[PDB]
Amino acid sequence: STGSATTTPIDSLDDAYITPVQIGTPAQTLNLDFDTGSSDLWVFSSETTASEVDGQTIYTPSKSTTAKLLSGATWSISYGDGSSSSGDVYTDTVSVGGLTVTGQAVESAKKVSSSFTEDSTIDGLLGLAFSTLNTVSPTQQKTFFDNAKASLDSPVFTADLGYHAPGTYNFGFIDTTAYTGSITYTAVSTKQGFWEWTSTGYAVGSGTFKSTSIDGIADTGTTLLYLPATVVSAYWAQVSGAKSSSSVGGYVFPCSATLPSFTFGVGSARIVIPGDYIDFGPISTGSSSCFGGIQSSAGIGINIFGDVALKAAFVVFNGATTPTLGFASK
Ligand SMILES: CN(C)c1ccc(C(=O)O)cn1
């Protein structure tokens, strides 16, 4: 089997991407944030504290003839941006782009933090990291991908995120029309539960490539590119007037600037992130100070190849017995 679904930016900055997902019988369609950095499929629901729901579409398990309470199971998760959610668990039928999994754990939120409430466009998350990170207790649950894998034509999914445009998540096949040149594959460590890999270096604009190993994670649920402070300083030094602002919470730059590209290495191959992709717009409405799309990972403990990086590539998440990542230009 295979599946193919369009993923759409939630706003004009590509702050996140949402993908429609069918849950239950009859189908209830929710728009979920596909997150290769976590491993829980959770949704706003009829159980979510009413004051914490503001415009989201909810899953109502009592209206699904295939929903079953997973008795005794609870979940609770916190994300790198400080947001969080928790609740109980149902199993139900879940379909993405025509690919159906029966008995998928659907984690129903009883509580969500303010940043979830405030984002009316995101109805929940669909985790695509390794199932070892799943938070359900006392019986850990599998991701949608793990549950689907054995049935797929090939044990893979691909992320093809758009810049200020829709893109595609495919399951079970590689669309050879969706990229240019060849796909370069690179080793993955699953030791931390992430799609963790090592970039071979970087370049800023038309500058020379610096060969240096940068360990990090391919994370579709993180907006920006978070890299070591040395790398990030080298980038922003090429933008007149750019500076790190402790008050804003990262590098800012004059909105009048033209940003240089940023290249990252995948083995001997190179992925080029156009300068425009690194512009996250005014820090507040009407400001001439703009927020940068490349930020330091120093506070975080891990480097993160978030959407800024991934959207410049066609990315293969190969879930074969020994997982690997693939990157192609597009
Ligand atoms: C809607 N918000 C608060 C989100 C969504 C997704 C993530 C994440 O995948 O890490 C974090 N915050």
UniProtKB/Swiss-Prot annotation:
Catalytic positions are: D35, S199
Q: Which GO terms describe its biological process?
A: proteolysis
Catalytic reactions on record: Hydrolysis of proteins with specificity similar to that of pepsin A, prefers hydrophobic residues at P1 and P1', but does not cleave 14-Ala-|-Leu-15 in the B chain of insulin or Z-Glu-Tyr. Clots milk
Any one GO molecular-function label of the UniProt entry: aspartic-type endopeptidase activity
Q: Does the keyword Signal apply?
A: yes
Every copy of the Peptidase A1 domain together lies at: 17-328
Its EC top class is hydrolase
Entry keyword Glycoprotein: no
What disulfide bonds does the UniProt entry report for this chain? Answer: C255-C290
EC numbers on record: 3.4.23.22
Question: Which UniProt keywords are given for this protein, alphabetically ordered?
Answer: Aspartyl protease, Disulfide bond, Hydrolase, Protease, Signal, Zymogen
Task: Give the record's family classification.
Answer: Belongs to the peptidase A1 family.
- Name under which the protein is recorded: Endothiapepsin
Q: Which organism is it from?
A: Cryphonectria parasitica
Q: What is the lineage of its organism?
A: Eukaryota, Fungi, Dikarya, Ascomycota, Pezizomycotina
